């Protein structure tokens, strides 16, 4: 008999139902987000970090470190091969 | 620290370097070695789903994964000219097979108890043939107890022995002979071939071990 008032009732529930769950999921991660490679930490030195940076990095990612390890184990084992036989 | 101890500590160091040292800062990009580890994880997890899946595959996936990586790192250090096959006794693989069979039997006797004896009679085979069936399946399980060790261990030792005998018998490759042409270089070709064969065999038999232990776990948990 009178005029009910829909057009300003969105205060109680934000428009949409499915994207409401994703709103909180995607709005919160943008605060603590790296602008462009912040704190890359590409430089380190712990007597083995240089080897990791030079060979164990994703830029090369080749089979050369495995061959170097094989050569090193051969060099180490030559001495005890002489010692045993 | 004996040869086996140093070999195992080096294996542990390199295997942990392949994961914790591959990550420069543990990015979400998932680099080529990271994506290789991801592919291996996905493959082992889908062994688990395909062969033991249905209620409790995820629970038993980790031992499949760990055994796969241990066998992978053992087989990787098998072709290096100095590489010794883990003190060259290979009884370790037999011990692993025996302990895995014992664990599977314990799991069967725990989750089924006396019902585990009903596994010897899958579908039919009535009373006149029941003792024969139970004897046959018990002997098959006893053979399974030794199948896994006398398999990977046997192939690794056979590959190493072939390596040694081949290298020994071509010692005159260009020492004093006059016929050391490509005909005399053919032995080098067969040595290269057995390099490739040993590599492929090691990888495919690691896969064999994974699928066999998955099937054994399925037979233990699920009675058919």
Curated annotation (Swiss-Prot), chain A:
F-type ATPases have 2 components, CF(1) - the catalytic core - and CF(0) - the membrane proton channel. In yeast, the dimeric form of ATP synthase consists of 17 polypeptides: alpha, beta, gamma, delta, epsilon, 4 (B), 5 (OSCP), 6 (A), 8, 9 (C), d, E (Tim11), f, g, h, i/j and k. Mitochondrial membrane ATP synthase (F(1)F(0) ATP synthase or Complex V) produces ATP from ADP in the presence of a proton gradient across the membrane which is generated by electron transport complexes of the respiratory chain. F-type ATPases consist of two structural domains, F(1) - containing the extramembraneous catalytic core and F(0) - containing the membrane proton channel, linked together by a central stalk and a peripheral stalk. During catalysis, ATP synthesis in the catalytic domain of F(1) is coupled via a rotary mechanism of the central stalk subunits to proton translocation. It comes from the Eukaryota. It is found in: Mitochondrion; Mitochondrion inner membrane. Keywords: ATP synthesis, CF(0), Hydrogen ion transport, Ion transport, Membrane, Mitochondrion, Mitochondrion inner membrane, Transit peptide, Transport. The lineage of its organism: Eukaryota, Fungi, Dikarya, Ascomycota, Saccharomycotina. One of its GO terms (biological process) is proton transmembrane transport. This is ATP synthase subunit f, mitochondrial. The chain holds residues 7 to 91 of 101 of the full protein.
UniProtKB/Swiss-Prot annotation, chain B:
Changing residue 196 to I: In strain: D273-10B/A1. GO terms for biological process: proton motive force-driven ATP synthesis. The chain crosses the membrane at residues 1-21, 57-77, 90-110, 115-135, 156-176, 181-201. GO terms for molecular function: proton transmembrane transporter activity. SUPFAM superfamilies: F1F0 ATP synthase subunit A. Changing residue 136 to M: In strain: D273-10B/A1. Pfam families: ATP-synt_A. The keyword Metal-binding does not apply. One of its GO terms (cellular component) is mitochondrion. Changing residue 206 to S: In strain: D273-10B/A1. It is found in: Mitochondrion inner membrane. It comes from the Eukaryota. Its main location: mitochondrion. The keyword Transport applies. It is a multi-pass membrane protein. InterPro entries: ATP_synth_F0_asu, ATP_synth_F0_asu_AS, ATP_synth_F0_asu_bact/mt, F0_ATP_A_sf. Keywords: ATP synthesis, CF(0), Hydrogen ion transport, Ion transport, Membrane, Mitochondrion, Mitochondrion inner membrane, Transmembrane, Transmembrane helix, Transport. Mitochondrial membrane ATP synthase (F(1)F(0) ATP synthase or Complex V) produces ATP from ADP in the presence of a proton gradient across the membrane which is generated by electron transport complexes of the respiratory chain. F-type ATPases consist of two structural domains, F(1) - containing the extramembraneous catalytic core and F(0) - containing the membrane proton channel, linked together by a central stalk and a peripheral stalk. During catalysis, ATP synthesis in the catalytic domain of F(1) is coupled via a rotary mechanism of the central stalk subunits to proton translocation. Belongs to the ATPase A chain family. PANTHER family: ATP SYNTHASE SUBUNIT A. F-type ATPases have 2 components, CF(1) - the catalytic core - and CF(0) - the membrane proton channel. In yeast, the dimeric form of ATP synthase consists of 17 polypeptides: alpha, beta, gamma, delta, epsilon, 4 (B), 5 (OSCP), 6 (A), 8, 9 (C), d, E (Tim11), f, g, h, i/j and k. This is ATP synthase subunit a. It comes from Saccharomyces cerevisiae (strain ATCC 204508 / S288c). The gene is ATP6.
């Amino acid at each position: 008999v009178s005029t009910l008032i829909p057009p300003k009732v969105v205060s109680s529930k934000n428009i949409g139902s499915a994207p409401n769950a994703k709103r909180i999921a995607n709005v919160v991660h943008f605060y603590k987000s790296l602008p462009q490679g912040p704190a890359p930490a590409i430089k380190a030195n712990t007597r083995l970090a240089r080897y990791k940076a030079k060979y164990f990095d994703g830029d090369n990612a080749s089979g050369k470190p495995l061959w170097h390890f094989a050569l090193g184990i051969i060099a180490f084992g030559y001495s005890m091969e002489y010692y045993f036989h | 620290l004996t040869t086996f101890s140093l070999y195992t500590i080096i294996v542990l160091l390199v295997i942990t370097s392949l994961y914790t040292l591959t990550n420069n800062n543990n990015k979400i990009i998932g680099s080529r070695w990271l994506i290789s580890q991801e592919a291996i994880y996905d493959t082992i997890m889908n062994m688990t789903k395909g062969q033991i899946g249905g209620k409790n595959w995820g629970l038993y996936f980790p031992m499949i994964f760990t055994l796969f990586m241990f066998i992978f790192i053992a087989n990787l250090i098998s072709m290096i000219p100095y590489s010794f096959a883990l003190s060259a006794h290979l009884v370790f693989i037999i011990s692993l097979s025996i302990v895995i069979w014992l664990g599977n039997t314990i799991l069967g006797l725990y989750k089924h108890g006396w019902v585990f004896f009903s596994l010897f009679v899958p579908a039919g085979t009535p009373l006149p043939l029941v003792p024969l069936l139970v004897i046959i399946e018990t002997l098959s399980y006893f053979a399974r107890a030794i199948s896994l060790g006398l398999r990977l261990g046997s192939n690794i030792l056979a590959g190493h022995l072939l390596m040694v005998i081949l290298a020994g018998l071509t010692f005159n490759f260009m020492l004093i002979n006059l016929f050391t042409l490509v005909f005399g270089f053919v032995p080098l070709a067969m040595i290269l071939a057995i390099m490739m064969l040993e590599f492929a065999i090691g990888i495919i038999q690691g896969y064999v071990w994974a699928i066999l232990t998955a099937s054994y776990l399925k037979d233990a948990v699920y009675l058919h």
